[PDB]
């Protein structure tokens, strides 16, 4: 398990995370765009895959999200995350900018907040 994975997200909540990405109205995909979205403060929540190699592609994201007050969590597979983001390829990370379901997003963020201590 990579040092960048700071807490373990139950598979059920990982599924909800992938679903939140899949129904989002606007997202950023991959480490470069996600990093910019967090720096800009426009990301509502950041999803990071646990199997990114090299780990340095996303290792800085947890610190950065915490430093910008932006919630983040994990899913097991960059391939699953890219497919949820509507891609034909993997995505190391995704930032939800404009979500599909505001209530669902709010509940998901709360659940994540509980996991991260």
Q: Which residues pair with 74 in a beta bridge?
A: 48
* Strand-pair category, 72-75 with 45-49: parallel
Instruction: Check: CB of residue 100 under 8 Å from CB of residue 53.
Output: no
Eight-state DSSP code of residue 45: E
Q: d(Cα 88, Cα 12) in Å, to the nearest integer?
A: 24
**Closest-CA residue to 108 (of 11, 2, 17):** 17
Contact of 29 with 87, CB cutoff 8 Å: yes
Contact at 8 Å (CB) between 3 and 59?
yes
The approach used to solve this structure was X-ray
Helix and strand element counts for the chain (H, E): 5, 4
Resolution value in angstroms: 1.9
What the chain holds in terms of domains, given with CATH numbers, is: 1-117 (3.30.1330.30)
């Amino acid at each position: 398990m990579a040092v960048y994975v700071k807490f373990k997200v139950p598979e059920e909540i990982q599924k909800e995370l992938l679903d939140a990405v899949a129904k989002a109205q606007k997202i950023k995909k991959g480490a470069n765009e996600v990093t910019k979205a967090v720096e800009r403060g426009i990301a509502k929540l950041v999803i990071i895959a646990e199997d990114v190699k090299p780990e340095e592609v996303v290792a800085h994201l947890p610190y950065l999200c915490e430093e910008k007050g932006i919630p983040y969590a994990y899913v097991a597979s960059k391939q699953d995350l890219g497919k949820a983001a509507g891609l034909e390829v993997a995505a190391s990370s995704v930032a939800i900018i404009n979500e599909g379901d505001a209530e669902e997003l709010k509940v998901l963020i709360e659940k994540v907040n509980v996991l991260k201590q």
